[PDB]
Design a protein around this ligand. Structure first.
Ligand SMILES: [Mn+2]
Ligand SMILES: [Mn+2]
Ligand SMILES: [Mn+2]
Ligand SMILES: [Mn+2]
Lengths: 284, 284
């Protein structure tokens, strides 16, 4: 029995709060003047251009996954009808995220190079392993593990890729592309918060023992994904001196992802020190 | 194997066309100054107010159905990855449609009366039969019948409800609510077109015999839904003289729904004559 949704009978105020934040933050890549980044693109080295296309084809795969499988997988596990609606928004915005990378490619890049980057991503072992691990949990029968995977993906792992446009922005390059990426981040910070909140709400009703099992699992999964992401970073950033900074940015964001789920930070300051210029690029 | 979506490799131009139309037409009920309809609401009779709330709780059920079951049910049957993305937009906008009725209720109506209308809709036999028939097809294993059901619902049956705000608009009442309803219609005209287009694309690959079976089924389903909708109309519009006009509007829209699916009109002019003031209200 389907019943008419009633937004004047909210069970959890957070659903309305997040519905309003996400919907009022609607954007499309056409709203960003990406074409003004052409001169800056022309100042990048061939290696830097290749890196940018590989970073973005990787993010395209992962946002496609979030649209096709990730957000839909959370729908059967909603606590409220309003959460179901918010999840439909989240799924749609993942499609916008994925679409936006094509907007960047169309504006700035040569088709032959973009296609090479897509092929590179298809054959990249750590990227594919990441996709496989996350999908495995989305396809599984444990609702709580799906939420852990989603938060780790877009509040943590994505930041190996997000680092790059923030770095360019800090150098005065690809500033419009950086604006677009900040719109994606503005969504993902809220997605991680909300999905993490709902994880904790779900946990309120499970047993003490299962809570302990899930925390140990979250740790296991974080460490596995982290080690894999270090390998991905090494392979992506190979022809640059930037891998250490990317890794620090990963650790910094891993702490945020953990906190979204209600867990304490795992990464000490020494491992999570982000260049102030990068942090400034995130919050201009 | 999930692969990164590539919007620079479009297989069917209609997917990009419809992605662009639907996304550029994004709106939220907060964008419409519904509160300016309060004076007009206060000029309606108790019977007219009751009718309005019953019409809108009915549409709330049906848009909720379209969000939760309808649009998602079409996703496994997409021909292209870009169609899958468009379907995520469609699903999200159904949530916006459903949410907008609560915006109207919050602004204009007394909670006790709104709750009575929700209860009335729960107990209304033809409304529930409509919901059941449509859901049955969404839950079935025939992809083509799901598309027929979706088009009949929102290019045809919804117009028993859409009639009312168009009528009020033609009388200079609830003009802001009518603007909001025109935004919903602007979406649904495109949804019906696109889903109907995809139905015809799917049919290109099925057998001549199955095409004939599906046409006969579409006719059977239309007639069944139509007879049920006449009963719904009678029960909704009971304390008014408007049932005949609503029914003519239903027949007029049934013809549009059929044409979306590639079928000839069934309803002659004599049954589909819409008051010019109502047509003007649709297209001001
Ligand atoms: Mn995303
Ligand atoms: Mn997300
Ligand atoms: Mn709708
Ligand atoms: Mn629709």
């Amino acid at each position: 029995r389907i019943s008419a949704i009633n937004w004047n009978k909210i069970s959890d105020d957070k659903d309305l709060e997040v519905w309003n934040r996400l919907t009022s933050n609607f954007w499309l890549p056409e709203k960003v003047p990406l074409s003004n980044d052409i001169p800056a693109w022309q100042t990048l080295t061939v290696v830097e251009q290749q890196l940018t296309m590989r970073v973005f084809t990787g993010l395209t795969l992962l946002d496609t996954l979030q649209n096709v499988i990730g957000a839909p997988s959370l729908m059967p596990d909603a606590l409220t009808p309003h959460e179901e609606a918010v999840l439909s928004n989240i799924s749609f915005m993942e499609a916008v995220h994925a679409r936006s990378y094509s907007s960047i490619f169309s504006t700035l890049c040569q088709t032959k190079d973009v296609d090479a980057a897509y092929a590179w991503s298809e054959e990249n072992a750590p990227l594919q392993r990441k996709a496989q691990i996350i999908q495995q949990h989305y396809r599984g029968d444990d609702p709580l593990k799906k939420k852990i995977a989603s938060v780790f993906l877009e509040s943590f792992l994505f930041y190996s890729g997000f680092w790059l446009p923030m770095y360019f922005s800090s150098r005065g390059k690809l500033t419009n592309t950086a604006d677009l990426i900040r719109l994606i981040i503005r969504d993902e910070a809220v997605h991680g918060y909300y999905i993490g909140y709902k994880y904790q709400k779900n946990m309120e009703k499970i047993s003490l023992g299962q809570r302990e099992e899930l925390k140990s699992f979250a740790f296991d999964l974080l460490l596995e994904l982290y080690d894999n992401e270090l390998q991905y970073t090494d392979e992506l950033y190979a022809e640059t001196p930037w891998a250490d900074d990317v890794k620090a940015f990963l650790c910094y964001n891993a702490n945020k992802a953990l906190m979204n789920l209600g867990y304490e930070p795992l990464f000490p300051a020494e491992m999570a020190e982000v260049n102030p210029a990068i942090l400034a690029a995130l919050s201009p």
